[PDB]
Design a protein around this ligand. Structure first.
Ligand SMILES: Nc1ncnc2c1ncn2[C@@H]1O[C@H](COP(=O)(O)OP(=O)(O)O)[C@@H](O)[C@H]1O
Ligand SMILES: Nc1ncnc2c1ncn2[C@@H]1O[C@H](COP(=O)(O)OP(=O)(O)O)[C@@H](O)[C@H]1O
Ligand SMILES: Nc1ncnc2c1ncn2[C@@H]1O[C@H](COP(=O)(O)OP(=O)(O)O)[C@@H](O)[C@H]1O
Ligand SMILES: [Mg+2]
Ligand SMILES: [Mg+2]
Lengths: 74, 57, 457, 456, 456
C-alpha cells in the first residue's frame, strides 16, 4: 500500500530538495481521482539544509542562520 | 526536655535556612556566568549574520 | 513603448525599457502572452526597472515583451464587491462570474491628514469576559490580538466576528493575508450558511502564493474599506495576519539590493509598517473598527516586528503560551494586555477598581508561585493562603467556552455580559465564594454557573 | 598538456591550462620541479582550475609548470598494505621499503546502491558494562564516540580495539585523521611488540599536516577497507577523529570562493559528510564494522558538525565532562546514549527491561538536582530517598577499570560479560543490595566484587 | 603639493594627491579656507588617502584644496599648558588667549624600549593612608578606579594632584575622554576654588565631537605627560573613562568598514589598548603613573573591554557608598581594593604583615557585624568583643582630612608618610592603644595626633 521515495545522504542536494514535491505529486494522483492518500516527509529540516546549500552556492543573499529569505515559501 | 527540644528545633531551623540562602546564591552565581556567555555568543552570531548578509548585496 | 525581461532571480524580475518610456514607481506592467502582472519597486538606472511578480514565475523567460499600463494596480470598489471573493488584483476567485463594478481604485494612497483625525470613546461590548474586563474596545478603534503559533488568535477573531459583525448594520471587509486555504474556505461557508455574506467582502492571498500577492493583498482590502469609509459609513475590517505583510517584505528584501538590519529583517521595517497602519484609522468622514491578529515569532514579544506593531494599536490583547499550556482558553495574559479605554472617565470607577484588583492579586500570585513550588503551601502566612486560593479561582474564572470552539471542547458556548463579569469578579475578590473549590470556576460562563457546577464535583 | 600556476593563496592554487586540455574534477596534478601533488576541485572557466595542494606550499611561485596525470589519486590496495604505515598519497612512511602491491584504487567512488545493502542485528559483546547495557553494538554496524576535549574518546577506542580483537579473526584498517603523532607511534609500537601488526593496515594524516592531507586521508583508509570488503571479508575500520575531516573542509572553504553558512562552516557540510559516510556500510559481498571518535567543539552538542554526524550512525555513545569530573570512567551519559539494537525483538525482554529501569531511575534522579542542592535529601519522600540511594549505586556501578587505563591507576582491568551486567543491574534495581554502601559499587567488574569490596 | 577632496561620506573624507606627494599614515591635513583638520588613516592607492575629520563636515564640498603639514598632529608641550583647557588639536578652549609654548610634539610615538625600562618595583607615596596601606601604587603603575557618583572621586583626584605637586615636585595631566560639558565646567571651577588648577594641564575631548577626537585625546594628554616625564619628573596622568576610549575605537573602526570581532568590538582592540598603555611606564629619566576610571558593561567582568583593560592594571581602588554613609572619607573599601604590589617580595614583610592583619580584622568584623545583627551583642565572646573594639579603631583610623576638603571637614589637611602609616596600624594591631576611645582615631594624621586628640 506504500510508495517509498528515497533521496539519501550521498545524493545531490537538488534531488534532496525535489524529493518531497515528487512524492507529493505521486500522492496527488490519488487525491485528484476521488481517493485518499497519506504522505510522510521524514525530514523537512534536511530539505531546508539542501536548499540552503543550493542558495549559498548560487550566491543568493542570506538571512537568519544563513538560510535564504524564501525558505518559508519552500 | 520537650520545651528545650523545641528551642533546639528552632536553632536547627535557623542554621538550615542560612545554609539554603547560601546555596541559592551559589546557584545564582553559576547561572549568571552561563547567562553572560550566552549574551556574548548571541551578539557575535547576530553580527556574523549582518556582515555575511551585507557582503552578498 | 514596451520593455524586455533581462533577469529573473526568484520572485524579482528586471525589465529594460527605452529611456523615454521608463515606468514610474508602483506602476503595473503586463507580460505579453502569459497571464502575469509585475509591480515596479525600483528604478535602477539605464532604463532598467526592478519588479515583483503578482503570479508564478514558471512560464517566464528572458526576452518577453512587457507593456506598461500607465497606472498602479487598480481593484474594484463599491457594493459590487459585497458577497464576493477576490484576489490581490481584484479578479474574482469564486465561480460567480464577473464583478460589475462602476469604479476602480489604485491600492497605493497617502495617509489621512492630522486635521482629518477624529477619535471617539464609545464602548463596544464583546461578550468575552477577560476582554470586557481588562481591555475594553472602542467604536472606530484599533485592536491587536498578539500571540504565538497555536494560542488561539483565529478562534478569538471568529468569536469577535460572531459577537460583533453579525448584528452590525453596516459593511465588513475580511482580508486573509498569508494564511491557510482551509480556514478561508471554512469562513466562506460559515458566512454563506449564516446569511451574513451579503454584507461582507472577502479578499484572499494565501501562504502558498508568490511573495508579491502576500505583499499587497492587505492594501487591496484596505482600499475597499477606504471606499466604504469615505462614503460616510461605519466599516468593520478584520486582518487575520498583518505579520505576513511584513514577512513577505523580508522575502524580497535582499534580492532588491538591501543590506539586512537586526534579526534578519528589512531595514525599512517601521516605515513599511507605518505606511500601512496609518491608513486604517477613522476620519471625520466615516469610521473604521479594525481587528487585526498579529503573529509573535517564537512567543518573543521583544522581537522587532511585534514591538513595532505595539505602538499602532488602541487596544492590545496578548495571548500567553503558558496559559494555553495550562488548558485555559481564551488564554489572555491579564497583566500584559492594556487598553486606552481603561480609564475611570470612560468605563466608570467600579469597573476600574475591579480590573486593578484582579491584576494586583494575579501579580502577587506570580511572585508566590515558585515559593509554593519549592517549600509548599503550609509555609506561608494566612493572607498569602487566602490570596493564592482567590487567585487560582480568578485564573480559572478568566476561562470561557466559545460558540466557535464547540468542535474543540465538546461543551456549548456562553455569552456573558459586562455587568455579570464585573459582579462575578467582584464577588470572587470580596471573598463571597471562598467556600467553593477552584475546579468550579473552570469553563462555566457567568458566576451562577460556577455555583451550579460546584454541586456536581 | 601542461599548465602554469597563476595564483597561490595558502593551500589553494589556481593553474591555467590550454583550452583543449583542461583536467577533470578530482584529477591529480604534479608540479614539475618539487613534485608537489595537487588535486583539482573546481573549473573556474578560462582554462583555469582551482586545486588544493597535498603538502606544503612554501617555496612555490607563480609561473611553475604543472603536469596532469590523467586520473585521480590512487593508493595501493590488497594484501600488501597489511603491517605497513602509509600517508594520504599511498607512499610508505615506515622506512621499510616499497609496498609490493598488485593494484591501485582511486580514492573517490560512489556509495553502494540500495539493492546492495545488508541488514543484520547480531550482537557484538564489548566487555564494557554501560556499552553492553544501554547502547549495544551489532556486527557490521556503525559506532560514534561523541565527546569534548580530554573526556576519553581515544582511551575508549583503544579498549574497544582490545576487546573487539578477541572474537574477530579478519583484518583491520586504522585511520588517524588530524590527531597526535605521538599516539600513532605508540599504537604502532604496541602492535609490533604484541605481534598483531600483520593484520592491521595503518593510514595517518595527523595535526602537523597541511589541510589537503587531513581533508583526504580518510578516503584512503576507506578505500583500503572497501577493497577488503569487496573481497568478501569481515573487516574492522577505526577512525580517530572524523571531525578533523570536516574542519579541514572549513580551512579551505573561503579560499575556494564559497559564502559561509552558520557559525562559519562550509555550505556543503552535510553533503561532504554523506559522501564520506555512505561508503562505510556493510554490503551483501562482505561486512565492515566501524568505530569512529567524534569531537564536540566547546562541549556543545548542538554545534552543526556533531548534529549532522548523529543520523549516520547505528550506535551513539555520548561522553560527559560532568560525569568524568565526578571521577566516573568510561564517563558515558546513559540518558544521552542510544542505539537501534536496544529493541525487545533483538536483545530480549529482560535486558531491555533492565535498561529501561536504569534509565527511569537516572532520569528521576536528574529531575531532583536543584531541590537536593537547596534543601537536601531529608525533605524528600521515602520512595524518593530510596530511588536516590539506588540511583547513586547505579551511577557508581556503571564505572569500570580498563586494561588500557592500567597505567593511570595501577588497578587491574576487568572484562564483564553481558549476563553478569544484566544480573547485577537487575539486583540493584530489585533491592537485593540496599544494605551495601555506595562506595563498594565503585570501580569493580562484577556485582560479586562489590560484595567482596563491601566487607573491607 | 596639495590635493582635492573627492569623497565625503560622514566624517570619512577621501582626498586625492599627486603620485609623488602622497602623505604618510597619521599625517595631519588642513582644508583651505576652513578651520577643518583631517588625520590620514589609510592609503587606498592612485594617490587617494582615506582620512577622518577632527570636527564637523557640514558645508564641505568636493573640489576643496587640502594642504599637508608634513607631520602628525602636534600639540603644545611644556609649562605653558598648566592651568589651561585644550582640545585634541592643542587649541585653547578657555577664553584666555594663545598658549605661549616653546615646543610642539606629535602625538604618535613608540613605547619606551626594553633597555629604557627603569627596573625595580619602587612605590609612589600618595600620602593617603588607606591607599599607602591597603592598595599601594607603583611608579609607572596603573590604577583602575571604580564606583559611581557622589562618593568622592573628584576630591581624591584633586588631593592626588596637590600631593604630587607639593610633596614630590611633579605635575599632572587630565585627559577627559568623552567629557560631559556640564561636568567639565564644574571640574574646572572646583579646581579653581581648591587652588590646584595651576598644577594640572587639562585636555577635554567632549561627547558631542566625532569619535576620532575622542580616540586621540588620551594620546594628546599622554604626549604632554611625556614632556613632563622627560624634564626629570614624576607625573600623574588621569583618564576619565578608558571604556569611552575603547568605544571610540569601535566607532572609528566601524566608520572605516572593518569587519567586527567578538561582542561587537574592533579587531584591533588589544593593539589599540597596548599602544596607549605601554607608553605609561617608569623609565630612566622619570615616570608617569596613571589613574583611570573604569566602567564595566552589563556588570560583566568577562566582557572583552574590561578583560583587555584588566590585563594592564596594577591596582584597583573601589569606592563604596556604605563607607561614605558612615562619614569616613575617603570612601575606599579596604577589602575590595586590590594591588599587585601587596606582596612581601615587593614591599617587604613588615608592610605586608600589617596590611594583611588589618584586612583579616576587618573581614572578621564584617562577618561578626552580621552575627551582632542576627542575634545581638550577648552572643559574642570576650575575644570577639576585643576584636570588634580594635576593628572600629582600625576603621576610624583609615579616615583622613584632606587639604582640598577643608571647606567640608573644617580642619587642616594632613600628609602622612608610609612609615607612620605602618607604625600606627601596627600600634593598633598590637593592642598598644586599647586605652584610647575610638573617636580619637577619627580624622587625624598619625597615631600621635590621635593620642593628643584623646586628651581633649
Ligand atoms: N477557545 C478555545 N477553546 C478550545 N480550544 C481552543 C481555543 N482556542 C484555541 N484552541 C485550540 O488551539 C488551536 C489553535 O488555535 P488557533 O486560533 O488556530 O491559533 P492561532 O491562530 O493563534 O495560530 C485550536 O485549533 C484549538 O485546537
Ligand atoms: N578509563 C579511564 N580511566 C582513567 N582515566 C581516564 C580514562 N579515560 C580517560 N581518562 C583520563 O582522561 C585523559 C584524556 O583521555 P583521552 O582518551 O585522551 O581523551 P580524548 O580522546 O577525549 O581527548 C586520559 O589521559 C586520562 O587522564
Ligand atoms: N574628603 C572629603 N571629606 C568630606 N566630604 C567629602 C570628601 N570627599 C567627598 N566628600 C563629599 O562627597 C560629595 C561628592 O564628592 P565629589 O568628589 O564631588 O563626587 P562626584 O565628583 O562624583 O560628584 C561631596 O559633595 C562632599 O560633600
Ligand atoms: Mg490562525
Ligand atoms: Mg584523543
Amino acid at each position: 500500500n506504500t510508495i517509498v521515495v528515497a533521496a539519501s545522504a550521498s545524493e545531490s542536494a537538488a534531488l534532496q530538495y525535489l524529493a518531497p514535491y515528487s512524492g507529493c505529486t505521486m500522492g496527488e494522483y490519488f487525491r485528484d481521482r476521488g481517493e485518499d492518500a497519506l504522505i510522510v516527509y521524514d525530514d523537512l529540516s534536511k530539505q531546508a539544509v539542501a536548499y540552503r546549500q543550493i542558495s549559498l552556492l548560487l550566491r543568493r543573499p542570506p538571512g537568519r542562520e544563513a538560510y535564504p529569505g524564501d525558505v518559508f515559501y519552500l | 526536655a520537650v520545651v528545650e527540644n523545641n528551642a533546639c528545633e528552632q536553632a536547627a531551623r535557623m542554621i538550615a535556612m542560612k545554609n539554603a540562602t547560601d546555596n541559592a546564591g551559589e546557584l545564582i552565581s553559576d547561572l549568571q556566568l552561563i547567562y553572560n556567555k550566552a549574551r556574548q555568543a548571541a551578539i557575535t552570531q547576530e553580527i556574523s549574520e549582518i556582515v555575511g548578509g551585507a557582503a552578498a548585496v | 513603448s514596451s520593455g524586455r525581461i533581462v533577469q529573473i532571480i526568484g520572485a524579482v524580475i528586471d525589465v529594460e525599457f527605452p529611456r523615454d518610456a521608463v515606468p514610474s514607481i508602483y506602476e503595473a506592467l503586463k507580460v505579453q502572452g502569459v497571464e502575469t502582472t509585475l509591480e515596479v519597486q525600483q528604478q535602477l538606472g539605464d532604463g532598467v526597472v526592478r519588479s515583483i511578480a503578482m503570479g508564478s514565475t514558471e512560464g517566464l523567460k528572458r526576452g518577453l515583451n512587457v507593456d506598461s499600463t500607465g497606472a498602479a494596480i487598480s481593484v474594484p470598489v463599491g457594493k459590487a464587491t459585497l458577497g464576493r471573493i477576490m484576489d490581490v488584483l481584484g479578479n474574482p476567485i469564486d465561480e460567480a462570474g464577473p464583478i460589475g463594478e462602476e469604479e476602480r481604485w489604485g491600492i497605493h494612497r497617502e495617509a489621512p491628514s492630522y486635521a482629518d483625525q477624529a477619535g471617539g470613546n464609545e464602548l463596544l461590548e464583546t461578550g468575552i469576559k477577560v476582554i470586557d474586563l481588562v481591555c475594553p474596545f472602542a467604536k472606530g478603534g484599533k485592536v491587536g490580538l498578539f500571540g504565538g503559533a497555536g494560542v488561539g488568535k483565529t478562534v478569538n477573531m471568529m468569536e469577535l466576528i460572531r459577537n460583533i459583525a453579525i448584528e452590525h448594520s453596516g459593511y465588513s471587509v475580511f482580508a486573509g493575508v498569508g494564511e491557510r486555504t482551509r480556514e478561508g474556505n471554512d469562513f466562506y461557508h460559515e458566512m454563506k450558511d449564516s446569511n451574513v455574506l451579503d454584507k461582507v467582502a472577502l479578499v484572499y492571498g494565501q501562504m502558498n502564493e508568490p511573495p508579491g500577492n502576500r505583499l499587497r493583498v492587505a492594501l487591496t482590502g484596505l482600499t475597499m474599506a477606504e471606499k466604504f469609509r469615505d462614503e460616510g459609513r461605519d466599516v468593520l475590517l478584520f486582518i487575520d495576519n498583518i505579520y505576513r505583510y511584513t514577512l513577505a517584505g523580508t522575502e524580497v528584501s535582499a534580492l532588491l539590493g538591501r543590506m539586512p538590519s537586526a534579526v534578519g529583517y528589512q531595514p525599512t521595517l517601521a516605515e513599511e509598517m507605518g505606511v500601512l497602519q496609518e491608513r486604517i484609522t477613522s476620519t471625520k468622514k466615516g469610521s473604521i473598527t479594525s481587528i487585526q491578529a498579529v503573529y509573535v515569532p517564537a512567543d518573543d514579544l521583544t522581537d522587532p516586528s511585534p514591538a513595532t506593531t505595539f505602538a499602532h494599536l488602541d487596544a492590545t490583547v496578548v495571548l500567553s503560551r503558558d496559559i494555553a499550556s495550562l488548558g485555559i482558553y481564551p488564554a489572555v495574559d491579564p497583566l500584559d494586555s492594556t487598553s486606552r479605554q481603561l480609564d475611570p472617565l470612560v468605563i466608570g470607577q467600579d469597573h476600574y477598581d475591579t480590573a486593578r484588583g484582579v491584576q494586583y492579586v494575579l501579580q502577587r500570585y506570580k511572585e508566590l508561585k515558585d515559593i509554593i513550588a519549592i517549600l509548599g503551601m503550609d509555609e506561608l502566612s494566612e493572607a498569602d493562603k487566602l490570596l493564592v486560593a482567590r487567585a487560582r479561582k480568578i485564573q480559572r474564572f478568566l476561562s470561557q467556552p466559545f460558540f466557535v470552539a464547540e468542535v474543540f471542547t465538546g461543551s456549548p458556548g456562553k455569552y456573558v455580559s459586562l455587568k455579570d463579569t464585573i459582579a462575578g469578579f467582584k464577588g470572587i475578590l470580596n471573598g463571597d465564594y471562598d467556600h467553593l473549590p477552584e475546579q468550579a470556576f473552570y469553563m462555566v460562563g457567568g458566576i451562577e454557573e460556577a455555583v451550579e457546577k460546584a454541586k456536581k464535583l
